[PDB]
Design a protein around this ligand. Structure first.
Ligand SMILES: Nc1nc2c(ncn2[C@@H]2O[C@H](COP(=O)(O)OP(=O)(O)CP(=O)(O)O)[C@@H](O)[C@H]2O)c(=O)[nH]1
Ligand SMILES: [Mg+2]
Ligand SMILES: [Mg+2]
Length: 180
């Protein structure tokens, strides 16, 4: 069945790992253990298709940009995670997207904007500005909590759906031809 290369990106401490672990292992990591680079696979059924999810869980801050370039090249789809009580992490999304587009040398890259930690009262990034940004990029926005698991499956499943749409659009192309 179809394999999907997903990459989870975002600033230090937004909950990239907690989201990924909730997805894979169904528990919430309460600790803060900074990531170098972790990879996971989960077989799931999404819209009646069996998917092999190959998930890359990236570091909050890359020491070597070459390490960032590589996962942006390999990734088929990107989970762009910010925390709703971390304004800078939300601002960092623009910079991730620019870096990904440049590396892919393309304007069309499957991504989903993820506002994590929605269980907190400390919200400094409002939903509207998140929604506005996602609308601007033409990608989905999903609010999640790794603590409660709210929205976690949805975030990953939606990314898979985005990758499918892209594959279809890339077969049909926009020009240079073609496919139906
Ligand atoms: N309240 C709440 N806390 C969360 C949530 N997700 C993660 N955390 C907490 O935030 C801290 C960092 O989470 P972690 O998943 O390691 O974030 P990360 O972005 O992977 C860290 P790095 O960028 O170094 O790899 C941990 O204390 C974790 O329990 C959430 O949805 N809600
Ligand atoms: Mg991590
Ligand atoms: Mg990062």
């Amino acid at each position: 069945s179809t394999e999907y290369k997903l990459v989870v990106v975002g600033a230090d401490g937004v909950g990239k790992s907690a989201l990924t672990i909730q997805l894979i292992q169904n528990h919430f990591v309460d600790e803060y253990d900074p990531t170098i680079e972790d990879s996971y696979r989960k077989q799931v059924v999404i819209d009646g298709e069996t998917c092999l999810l190959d998930i890359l869980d990236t570091a909050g801050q890359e020491e070597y940009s070459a390490m960032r370039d590589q996962y942006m090249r390999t990734g088929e789809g990107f989970l762009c995670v910010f925390a709703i009580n971390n304004t800078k992490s939300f601002e960092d999304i623009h910079h991730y997207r620019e870096q990904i587009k440049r590396v892919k040398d393309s304007e069309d890259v499957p991504m989903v904007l993820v506002g994590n930690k929605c269980d907190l009262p400390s919200r400094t990034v409002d939903t509207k500005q998140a929604q506005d940004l996602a609308r601007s990029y033409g990608i989905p926005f999903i609010e999640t909590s790794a603590k409660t698991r709210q929205g976690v499956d949805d975030a990953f499943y939606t990314l898979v759906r985005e990758i499918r749409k892209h594959k279809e659009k890339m077969s049909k192309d926009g020009k240079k031809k073609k496919k139906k």
